[PDB]
Amino acid sequence: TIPHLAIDPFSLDFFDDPYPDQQTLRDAGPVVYLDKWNVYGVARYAEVHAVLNDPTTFCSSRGVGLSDFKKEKPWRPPSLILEADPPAHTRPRAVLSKVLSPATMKTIRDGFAAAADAKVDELLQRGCIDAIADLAEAYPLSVFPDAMGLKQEGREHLLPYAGLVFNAFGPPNELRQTAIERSAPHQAYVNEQCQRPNLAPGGFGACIHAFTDTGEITPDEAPLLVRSLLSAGLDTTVNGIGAAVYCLARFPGELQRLRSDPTLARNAFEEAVRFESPVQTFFRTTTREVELGGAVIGEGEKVLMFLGSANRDPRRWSDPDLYDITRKTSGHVGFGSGVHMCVGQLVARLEGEVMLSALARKVAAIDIDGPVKRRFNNTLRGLESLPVKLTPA
Numbered sequence: 001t002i003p004h005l006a007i008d009p010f011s012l013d014f015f016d017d018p019y020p021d022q023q024t025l026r027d028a029g030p031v032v033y034l035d036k037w038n039v040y041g042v043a044r045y046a047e048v049h050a051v052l053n054d055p056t057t058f059c060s061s062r063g064v065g066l067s068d069f070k071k072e073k074p075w076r077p078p079s080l081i082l083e084a085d086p087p088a089h090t091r092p093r094a095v096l097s098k099v100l101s102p103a104t105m106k107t108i109r110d111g112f113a114a115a116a117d118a119k120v121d122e123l124l125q126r127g128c129i130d131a132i133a134d135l136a137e138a139y140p141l142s143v144f145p146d147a148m149g150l151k152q153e154g155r156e157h158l159l160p161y162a163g164l165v166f167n168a169f170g171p172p173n174e175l176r177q178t179a180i181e182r183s184a185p186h187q188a189y190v191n192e193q194c195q196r197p198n199l200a201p202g203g204f205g206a207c208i209h210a211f212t213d214t215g216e217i218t219p220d221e222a223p224l225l226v227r228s229l230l231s232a233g234l235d236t237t238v239n240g241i242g243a244a245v246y247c248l249a250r251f252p253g254e255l256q257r258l259r260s261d262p263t264l265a266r267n268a269f270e271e272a273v274r275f276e277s278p279v280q281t282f283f284r285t286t287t288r289e290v291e292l293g294g295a296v297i298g299e300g301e302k303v304l305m306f307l308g309s310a311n312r313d314p315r316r317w318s319d320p321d322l323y324d325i326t327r328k329t330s331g332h333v334g335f336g337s338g339v340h341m342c343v344g345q346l347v348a349r350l351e352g353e354v355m356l357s358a359l360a361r362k363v364a365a366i367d368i369d370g371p372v373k374r375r376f377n378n379t380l381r382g383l384e385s386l387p388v389k390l391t392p393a
């Protein structure tokens with residue numbers, strides 16, 4: 001009764017243009033079986049949301065990539081937060097939620113905004129720039145390593161390490177194999193910066209280590225939670241900001257609306273997260289036989305959630321393939337949903353907001369003026385190169 005499809009959602013052709021295949025996945029049924037990788041798939045909003053919100057049945061501790069940690073050794077020691085289930089998940093999550101809290105956002109917002117304004121001013125002096133290297137990468141690199149408390153030396157490891165982490169959630173294709181082949185120097189740098197003496201006072205890493213005397217985490221858990229932020233906290237924002245700039249470049253009417261009301265910056269970023277869904281996919285593993293969308297899935301089965309597809313599902317969204325900066329975006333799953341819903345989302349939204357505010361106040365037009373090149377990753381969707389001309393306001 002479950003339809004079987006040969007679509008490979010980790011193939012370069014799929015990454016190059018996922019939208020037709022995502023409609024095929026949605027319209028085939030609420031639950032599909034992907035014969036290429038022997039996993040179940042859910043691509044509609046309803047089933048993605050249901051799976052996210054039943055962590056008991058659809059667990060994370062057997063891994064949120066294709067690999068099942070009950071069958072294979074994880075490529076690195078499991079994350080204490082992303083790859084943990086309640087109750088072990090709960091207190092590390094609470095620590096990261098306090099480290100990346102509103103009060104923290106209040107302490108960093110002015111500096112993050114000043115850096116965003118400064119970057120757009122610098123880019124306007126050049127006029128023609130690459131909105132990936134020169135903006136989507138450069139701006140997070142200018143604020144997030146410092147906010148972590150990292151030293152200057154070795155920061156060139158951070159984007160390659162993150163690319164490895166996000167490729168490693170994928171199946172054992174060439175993208176994953178090559179990433180792991182090149183991993184040893186990046187893992188070495190990252191594991192070393194996770195130690196308490198290497199994290200500057202007041203930054204996110206030091207604050208994690210400071211929580212090790214409350215009973216929520218022990219000192220030996222703090223380095224792995226720092227590792228979580230060094231895995232996730234930079235490349236996600238690169239692709240979120242890149243998505244927002246790409247949306248504004250393709251939809252100039254929405255850039256004009258944003259210029260006319262810069263307080264739409266935060267929602268324009270949120271809509272870009274829905275529209276592009278930089279984090280495309282995550283897996284769960286069933287802990288029992290379960291009925292989902294009328295289908296019966298056995299115990300110990302991997303279930304692939306298409307977050308980007310759920311965010312384009314016309315069963316949930318009006319005009320899903322339109323970028324609309326005043327859309328009611330609440331409920332999109334681009335940050336997940338439920339107990340694992342992105343604990344760094346306030347950092348992501350802060351960066352995206354202040355960059356889009358800088359653009360709204362300083363830029364009159366964003367025109368693609370060179371070849372667009374896509375970046376291929378088993379989990380992240382985004383561009384390698386986005387040549388644009390920025391016209392000043």
Ligand code: HEM
Nearest residue numbers: 081082232233236237240279334335336340342343344348
């Ligand atoms: C636009 C940017 C981002 C997007 C689209 C995004 C997406 C997501 C998603 C979909 C999840 C859910 C994972 C799951 O259900 O298995 C998640 C969780 C998480 N994110 Fe983000 N993220 C972003 C930025 C960040 C940032 C900036 C940080 C850190 C500063 C961060 C740290 C985390 C962590 C630690 C988790 C695990 C939370 C848990 O398992 O309880 N993320 N993110």
Ligand SMILES: O=C(O)c1ccc(-n2ccnc2)cc1
Nearest residue numbers: 079082227228231232236279
């Ligand atoms: O704990 C980890 O190692 C880890 C945690 C979170 C992500 N992630 C994905 C999207 N936002 C964050 C990636 C890795």
Ligand SMILES: [Cl-]
Nearest residue numbers: 076187190191
């Ligand atoms: Cl590592």
